[PDB]
Symmetry: D2
Subunit: 219 residues, 4 copies
């Protein structure tokens, strides 16, 4: 019974994108067994951000995924001790980000130690010009590679003017504790959304919904 | 109204993989509005194949996709005149394939002119050693890029010994007729499966099921 | 040894690019120990070509490389029996080509059986619109990977309007005979040029100069 | 006139690799017009480093390149005001690094503000296990892309046991001052070398030699 149906979330992100330093605090709440989660974010340093806030949002826990009984839930099995993930975000225009989160737990509260770094965004590109609207929904492919749980995603940012700006995700997920049983090949559907924000995005309210599945023919 | 609920499928593939020439004939049936399709394949030249048959199977029509009414069906709109697609298959171990299909229609029957080429498969790899079992199911991301309909997929071959061998698909789809309406960003779930085969895979029965959707939260 | 300071070259290429079939014959001469080589090419089928001829030109023998004594010459050691290579050409705009050449020798003459395939060139792109001028010179990195001699190159096509169109080469080189000694990590500088051509590029005269080296400080 | 034939070099690097924080100070000298440079490095925080020191070494100025007169020297023209570069290091085994350097000048001294970040290095890989010997020499391809000076390199680390571990560099170089003339397509040969180090690599002496050129036939 280590994970409770209602959990609190504390987060701190430190980052550097195109040479710009920043620090962002996060405070949120979530329902792990329903695969849903919400968070309020506040830029504590480096505001106002000179880049598109949307690039950060997926760095702000796969614990908040609705897993069917017939699929192994690696993420919930990682607790109480916790787990870490490392991610690479490869954008179609040469922009490249890397990110990390060390996730632990105390009582009803998840703690997130997050780092986010980025370079090679063109000065006239959508991220530096803040021409982003939202991430499209996605389907993350979960598989094991040399004993490490890995997720690959084809992601896309919707742009002003109804074009799309493509990004490839790769994430590695590692439990702290030895001998957590790895899952079989499966899928995780995503939908992430900014519900509200102030003008400079110094304050942002974020929401995520995510569900695991086995694909066709078992839709 | 050109596409009928029950369609016949005639196919011919010429190919060359790691220097090995081959020709494969195909004869099948399908239900376009249900997104389901079947085919019998016969190796006419270059049998027995020295590589894994599984690499070819997705080259053996997105017409056979179940589209909801709220998503534009580019593929069914492309007929009677037809359409063509070009695909790149980038394998994790440097192996690389390209393929193409020109698709036309006469009365009841789809005609498929298919080409398939491949190089740089390591001699000790799963393809050249025929250590493949099946493709996992997939979710193809459909989007428009510079006016061209494009699908990217994270694909995986299940190996003997329950490991996975990763491949990235990219496909472009082009209607023959000029003014066919492009769809919005959406998804196509896949499941492709070899139902039966003889020992050397000179005769193979193939099946595909595919459904289009808009992701979460509408799933 | 088998290789004479002046050699003849016979070549035959069969190809398919963006669905377009073609056949090209080649007749040339070269100085292996000087790393220089020349060839006359004639399109025998599929002329006039609807794509940029420049794409093909590196498929038209690393035997013609000037090797210093302190670097192992894998290519000249492969004869009389010969060798084969397989290449992938990954273009910046998604265009993708693969090629292969089986090279044998009789008396003073090299024989080249060549295949060249390509897909996913955008209809609007520099290749399909024949906006290419030349390949820039290059430096190919030669190294051994899992017992196979491999060369990676950062290539670039100079475009009309003085822009550049980038392509990544990867080539594997395999001697036909067992136990040809592999070289250490080294470099091969290239310069390939079209000396002349008729209007439709049905007839083309081609030239290559190539020199092996060990990099700094020995330049 | 801003660049003198003998120059001093002051450097500070902050970094984070696989979650490990570190700070490294650097003090060196160089001969810009000869393309030669050397530096003493001292780990001030996070020592001893749990990863291979070699990965950092190219982050420790293209000013120190020997440019011929017939090629535009963007880097020396960027002073006194200075310039910045941003780099991506994509390793063959999924490991990925990013780096940045803001370079300024006062009197005879260059000042380097450097950041270096890395994730997704496998725990059993050559970087995390410190199985690295040296970078091979290299040839960087310099070209302009959408008005930005860019360098791509095929790099390789020599491993214990005489294998190679491949990495792709991409770097963007941006002068601080408006209207510094961009160069034409050209090449920069490199050779970087650790001259000495203590057991834990808390103290390291580094050397670089680099020469620009136009390739064959003028090599």
């Amino acid at each position: 019974s280590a994970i409770k149906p209602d959990m609190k979330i504390k987060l701190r992100m430190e980052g550097n994108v195109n040479g710009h330093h920043f620090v962002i605090d996060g405070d949120g709440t979530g329902k792990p067994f329903e695969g849903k989660q919400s968070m309020d974010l506040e830029v504590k340093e480096g505001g106002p951000l000179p880049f598109a806030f949307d690039i950060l949002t997926t760095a702000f826990n796969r614990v908040f995924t609705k897993y069917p009984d017939n699929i192994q839930d690696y993420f919930k099995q990682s607790f109480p001790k916790g787990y870490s993930w490392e991610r690479s975000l490869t954008f179609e225009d040469g922009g490249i980000c890397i990110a990390r989160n060390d996730i632990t737990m105390e009582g009803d509260t998840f703690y997130n130690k997050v780092r986010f770094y980025g370079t090679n965004f063109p000065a006239n590109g959508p991220v530096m010009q803040k021409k982003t609207l939202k991430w499209e929904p996605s389907t993350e492919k979960m598989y094991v590679r040399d004993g490490v749980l890995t997720g690959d995603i084809h992601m896309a940012l919707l742009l002003e003017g109804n074009a799309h700006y493509r990004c490839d995700f790769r994430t590695t997920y590692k439990a702290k504790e030895k001998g957590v049983k790895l899952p079989g090949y499966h899928f995780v559907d995503h939908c992430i959304e900014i519900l509200s924000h102030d003008k400079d995005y110094n304050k942002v309210k974020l929401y995520e919904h995510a569900v695991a599945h086995s694909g066709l023919p078992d839709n």
